[PDB]
Symmetry: C3
Subunit: 214 residues, 3 copies
């Protein structure tokens, strides 16, 4: 079977190409930067911290964060839980957003080709890692790392808000982000809002690349 071996080798070479590109790529942010910025302001009210974190992010990384007139809270229904996001930055390999919920929810965390860090500004974050029978609760200031290829169970109490950074192959999350919209909530207006904010963030990153070149 020459063609099946060619398919195996070709899919392997595509994976190898993306993996080597992700290892040798320059990034705008890093998980430690976002985590420390969020932990520094985790002692305030989460709204005050939201404002301060957005201001600091726009100061240190101009042209990589959406403006105030492009920021809106969009519901996120995924993995059986329901939260809300405010997207600040998004490329093909990075994204920064404000995430959280005003209700008690929980479910599957997803399993993607990306590493996702969450630093709690308020509330509680229960993580139940795969292969164990016990979970751990995290509090404001802490940082949870949803590692690459790993799947956990997440649970948040009412009023839990955090700053989120994802790095890796971001498209590998879209299916997880849309399943509950297609097969449960049927809230396609929220789907439109999500597509709109992510289109805006991608266009911002493209315009910044063009502005850097000229």
């Amino acid at each position: 079977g020459l063609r099946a071996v060619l398919v195996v080798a070709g899919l392997a070479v595509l994976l190898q190409l993306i993996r080597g590109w992700l290892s040798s790529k320059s990034y705008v942010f890093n998980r430690e930067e976002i985590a420390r910025l969020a932990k520094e302001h985790s002692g305030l009210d989460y709204e005050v911290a939201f404002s301060k974190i957005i201001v600091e992010l726009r100061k240190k990384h101009p042209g990589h964060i959406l403006q105030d007139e492009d920021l809106q809270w969009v519901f996120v229904n995924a993995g059986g839980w329901m939260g809300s996001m405010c997207l600040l930055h998004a490329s093909l390999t990075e994204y920064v957003l404000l995430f959280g919920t005003a209700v008690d929810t929980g479910g599957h965390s997803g399993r993607y080709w990306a590493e996702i860090s969450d630093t709690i500004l308020s509330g509680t974050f229960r993580q139940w890692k795969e292969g164990t029978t016990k979970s751990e609760i995290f509090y404001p200031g802490d940082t949870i790392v949803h590692e690459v290829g790993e799947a956990t169970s997440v649970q948040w109490s009412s009023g839990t808000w955090m700053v989120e950074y994802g790095r890796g192959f971001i498209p590998s999350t879209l299916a997880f982000a849309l399943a509950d919209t297609i097969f449960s909530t049927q809230d396609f207006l929220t789907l439109f809002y999500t597509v709109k904010v992510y289109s805006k963030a991608l266009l911002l990153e493209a315009s910044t690349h063009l502005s850097q070149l000229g």
Copy 2:
């Protein structure tokens, strides 16, 4: 120009339906159901259920199913799980008793209909779109899930309420069945839901025929 023509055609359809819903006669109204439920909100929710059903059959004869056509049917939707007892249902109205004996919550749905819920017992947490804070509602209060808006709903164990919906009722069907098709696989409950809805529609049609002749 073809796309503008498509937009205009759907707009003319929307205005025709919207003007029909605004100038249509209705059997109930959301304020009537809300006041009736709040009047009995101080008693036990089951006893209040009985009194509310009797009062509705008195004020609106021929528009409410009889006792042998009332049954509790599970409702799995938007990630939450409750139960309903349908009392009335047409193409533009429905009245039911809703609630849950477990702690659940999820997406409220987004339809072309206005849905009001008056709590008989328990707690009702509503989280409106675009905000970072939610609110808890108690027996006697009424939540209005307005047309086109989406919220997050959450109910504690033992939460029961009286619900009235007005608008384009078919626009909710998909939501009410999604979790049954793609999660629970409880097609017997799907049959129960289709059955109770068919009974309510047939009651409304036969009542219209009897009033006309």
Copy 3:
């Protein structure tokens, strides 16, 4: 006559259902619900991990060759009916399965509706059951046993740290649709789907190899 074709389909499905029902009524089983319930309640006073170990030991002694070995035991996430838990499969055939189930988070949802009877004996935590057609639920504690009967559908809810021993008997294939739906249409965690298929393949092959060893 099209009515003849519809009656032929109905009658054929009826004879198939009767054939499976009669096979299930005259079949020999490895376990029974009372055995698993009493064994779990006997160790329900200990920590759930210690009870897990003791229950597995007793089960492997009383039914050798029908339970997977230690290197074939792994915790696999179970997303179904809107809830999320975890399983450790010990035994599984086409008509029986024994596993350890539970959750370390607060979850709940639809219990499912299959052609099988499923029993759960609580080792720790709380188990809230809401039966169909009623407006009240009941909470059950370690030592109690919940029976998810054939054809019934309930709402289940578990508090964080709730663990139990589960036995199912009936037509096990009738559960696959429920057991995988949330993975296909929500979590997209196909690696967990692979883990589930792997452990079930191991249990089925163990039962087949045990029958072959008994025959020769």
